UniProtKB/Swiss-Prot annotation, chain C:
Regulation: Inhibited by divalent lead ions.
Protein name as it appears in the record: Delta-aminolevulinic acid dehydratase
Pathway assigned in UniProt: Porphyrin-containing compound metabolism; protoporphyrin-IX biosynthesis; coproporphyrinogen-III from 5-aminolevulinate: step 1/4
Single GO molecular function: zinc ion binding
EC number, as in UniProt: 4.2.1.24
Keywords, comma-separated and alphabetical: Heme biosynthesis, Lyase, Metal-binding, Phosphoprotein, Porphyrin biosynthesis, Zinc
Family recorded in the similarity comment: Belongs to the ALAD family.
Native source species: Saccharomyces cerevisiae (strain ATCC 204508 / S288c)
Amino acid sequence: MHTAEFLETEPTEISSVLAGGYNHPLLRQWQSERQLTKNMLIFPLFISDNPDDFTEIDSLPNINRIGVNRLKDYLKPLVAKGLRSVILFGVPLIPGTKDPVGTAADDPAGPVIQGIKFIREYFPELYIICDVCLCEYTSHGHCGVLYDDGTINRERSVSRLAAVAVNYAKAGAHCVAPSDMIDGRIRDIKRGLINANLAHKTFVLSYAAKFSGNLYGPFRDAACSAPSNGDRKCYQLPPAGRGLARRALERDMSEGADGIIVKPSTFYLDIMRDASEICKDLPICAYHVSGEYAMLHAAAEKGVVDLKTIAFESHQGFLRAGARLIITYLAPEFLDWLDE
Amino acid sequence: MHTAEFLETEPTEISSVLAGGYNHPLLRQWQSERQLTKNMLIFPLFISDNPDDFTEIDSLPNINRIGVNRLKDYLKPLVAKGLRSVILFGVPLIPGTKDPVGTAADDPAGPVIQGIKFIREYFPELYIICDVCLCEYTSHGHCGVLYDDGTINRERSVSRLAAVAVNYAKAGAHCVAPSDMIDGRIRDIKRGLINANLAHKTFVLSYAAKFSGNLYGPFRDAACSAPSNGDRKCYQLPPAGRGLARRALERDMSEGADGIIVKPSTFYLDIMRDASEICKDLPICAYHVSGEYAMLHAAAEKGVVDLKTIAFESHQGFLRAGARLIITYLAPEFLDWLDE
Amino acid sequence: DDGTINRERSVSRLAAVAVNYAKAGAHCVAPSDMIDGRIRDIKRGLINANLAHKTFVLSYAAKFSGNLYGPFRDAACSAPSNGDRKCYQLPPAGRGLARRALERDMSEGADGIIVKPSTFYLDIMRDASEICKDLPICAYHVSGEYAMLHAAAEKGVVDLKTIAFESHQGFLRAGARLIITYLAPEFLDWLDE
Amino acid sequence: MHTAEFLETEPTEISSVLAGGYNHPLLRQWQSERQLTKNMLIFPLFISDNPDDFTEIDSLPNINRIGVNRLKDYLKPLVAKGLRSVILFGVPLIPGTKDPVGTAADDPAGPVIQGIKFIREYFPELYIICDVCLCEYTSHGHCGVLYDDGTINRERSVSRLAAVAVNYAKAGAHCVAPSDMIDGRIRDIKRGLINANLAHKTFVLSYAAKFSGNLYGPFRDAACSAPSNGDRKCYQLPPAGRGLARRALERDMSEGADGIIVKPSTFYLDIMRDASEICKDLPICAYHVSGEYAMLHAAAEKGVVDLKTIAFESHQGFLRAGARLIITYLAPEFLDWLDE
Ligand SMILES: *C(CO)CCC(=O)O
Ligand SMILES: *C(CO)CCC(=O)O
Ligand SMILES: *C(CO)CCC(=O)O
Ligand SMILES: *C(CO)CCC(=O)O
Ligand SMILES: [Zn+2]
Ligand SMILES: [Zn+2]
Ligand SMILES: [Zn+2]
């Protein structure tokens, strides 16, 4: 008859015993290199050129396109809940606004600058971060000024991007986040800020590690940034490009970045780990993109996982990988959860 | 009139130029530290104690519970497609089979050992990996022998696990993968193998970094391993426990592991990166758990992402993070995709 | 018989005490003896008592001899009898010894370590953060440091809440992620604002 | 009856035995990476524009504001005791002396330059260090030239600071210690020195790691440097800013610093440890600020600790953390103590 067999074991080696460090709920916290707090969250904002706007984004569950006239009633509760920072994204819908050089990018009458002025007056305690790019302002939809052939023109592009970033800062933005990925843009942006005498008050949060992938979905709807002819795989790092990512991190830091952003996040946790060593002295921010965010909601709906649970697992994964800041659409939720 | 502003730029710094390394499709490959190949895939197999079995797992799309009599027709096409390895999971459904010491675990008449003998004869070229645990064979459902209170009994547990692993090897398994997570089990398993004169032919692939989370869903259905009273957070590493994970990796390696497994995968990519340094001389395997696998399918169904695309992004993320082996339910698909 | 500690009997006794505390229901034991090799014996005792998997071992790996243990001598009534405690307690300048003790205790089974004093030994916390990078590090704001802040605050040399925050956040900066302090009640209030 | 229990112990492991290295008083010295000597001390001097001055500073016990006419009788005993270096701080009390550009900073008739000339003639063997800043010479009280809004103007500020440092060197100072903390001031000061052909005889001791805190008390009295509107938290490193401190250390070194100062000291011992690695090839100096100094006296008075004892513990803590130089108000005392 088959009976349970027990092998002859040796005395337990102390070096084998790790269980004593995580047998209690409190220990789970002690074991964390970093704990999740409210001031670590950065809520994205999609400002429309229509003051009374407040449309719901398709691919972006619970996220809408707001106009200045609705901001106040939208931010009030969040700020009271502990929100400390926001990242502005402009969405000009007015016809004839876009062009080949993203002129509307720093339009003082545009959504971005209008939102900055609005927030600075009604919420002088909120930290204002502005994404810096021309994708949402170009006729083509790309992140920069294209040559005649279609490929980006670094020189003119960065020249333009630097102006935009400086103008946002001039408008009152505390921080600029260039999501273009164009070679050397950080240096020119830093120089522009220095020349505008704003380098000492403007934090430069560079999207140092921005990979091309299948998770930018929803954002394409909310921001309306559909590339025109060709792939964005010209500037956006290849998913397997770890070496390039490491070099971009070092480059951006050396070019003046005060902090860096890794995007996507969950699917690029190893990259956050790399940035934590290379950019050990700088704050690292994780960007939970629309695609990852929508992916969690989808799986939760199909009962594959619990939203709050998986939301916590993923976010605390960012902190584990080395991030100390998080740009997420789940901010409103966390502002509640972190209370319990 | 608001007009496009262009800042005065300096000459481009060579150190800024990285674009020259990934402007072509072929370059995307050259930029990869490791390329995805067929022999890197490990398909999981859920063997039932019913020879004619072939039930579809709920929470596990396209995955079923097979009986020995259906294996052959199921493996034939996969093997012809390039499959080189499998990881066996036993699913005894016969009543009165489970007990307090997982006696049925190494039952020569059980699904696991029956599957090994079957595969070794019909597919002598397939690499046979066997998960090693007692969760699916205990009355309680836990991964080991519990004390009277309910908490695991390391001594008896590891003593039992070592016997099971050795018996699988004796049956003919090429590799054993202890997924228990009980402190010091690797040492006892290695010693048992050495004493059984099988240490030189048995690869020990330890689940060194196994985290507790919300992604083990589907498996609970396929394997029928529902914990009885309490949480598995007693042995399974806490999601934020990076320090513990690093110590477990070092421990298992020092205890005789020939390779290590990181599970989950995607949500723990930073941990794979850590293992790649600590266990730089050992092969690292990523385990795309049921929850992650189901999460991709769910998101794909909701049109949030494309299955093939995101499947490739996630898998190539494993390789980027340092893994050179992958246990995934998407193996059948990749065996097709890798052809194009 | 001479007066100097007897490691063998001492550690033998300490291990029993720690195990009994655990048997009583304590989640964690913190050996503040500083006697060579006590962590190993305590871990072994716990293993033999089948409590090693539920008992966290928080060792005072870096305990220095100094002029800041004042107040505690009153509260605990632990006045040494003949001689100095400088026999086991690390010398204030002993960085090398502190580093070796940290490594030793970790290798002996410590699940976490305590650095005491704290403020006056911030560099040691920094060392422990590298050596014991995978373990939680705890700072112990001793009675002397605690009383020193109150004294200076009373003399209007500094503001209690302010300096309390500066010192504590100094512990975190130096690498600690846990803090044993008498200012806890206060922080439980302050951290609310 | 409760009786003493003794567990069964194993043979002592040699690796456990460390006691053999510090069982004797002499061993306490052998165990020190660096021993405290007289030539390691740097006594601060507050020179007033009143030659017969000699007022006692409130918040600074045993420290006074001296005029040139009292220096000689004040330094004579200290120098005979072994004093080898001093750090000069100017305290112009004459009305209409301060202005928006700290003009009086390098006034040849000012206290600082007057003190240098005095010391160079009566004590040609003393090493003269001069703090470099404009806080004590500006109408506002800040460490530099402010813009119209109130925030520092780096360009003009550093431009001014470089002139001041060079003029001190021209006057005869052996070393300059810029305590401004303004970005890039070290580079301009080094360049000015090079252009003045004094770079080979002037040691640049930068306050690389100067944190904002609650320990600058007493100095505000002795130096009379009360900020006007706003916080000094604009240039002074945030108490938790380790990353910034590490970057400032590297920056200053690369900019020409021959040595660096960490201030405060005791409360920033971990920072001294960081500097010891980053600036391993440069001498590191600890600054026992007024607040820490007064804190020891206060605690000693309340019988919380013994002055001599705690003075020794704290100072030898600086050496342990990596410093090999110490700027302290307890110098006079140590010049006595180090004799026994
Ligand atoms: C990145 C654009 O800067 C954000 C994409 C998203 O989906 O959040
Ligand atoms: C882990 C059990 O050993 C596998 C879980 C899964 O869902 O694949
Ligand atoms: C250390 C005794 O274990 C504590 C001393 C104190 O004053 O807190
Ligand atoms: C720093 C000014 O440079 C000295 C402050 C003190 O209190 O010593
Ligand atoms: Zn863009
Ligand atoms: Zn199991
Ligand atoms: Zn100043």
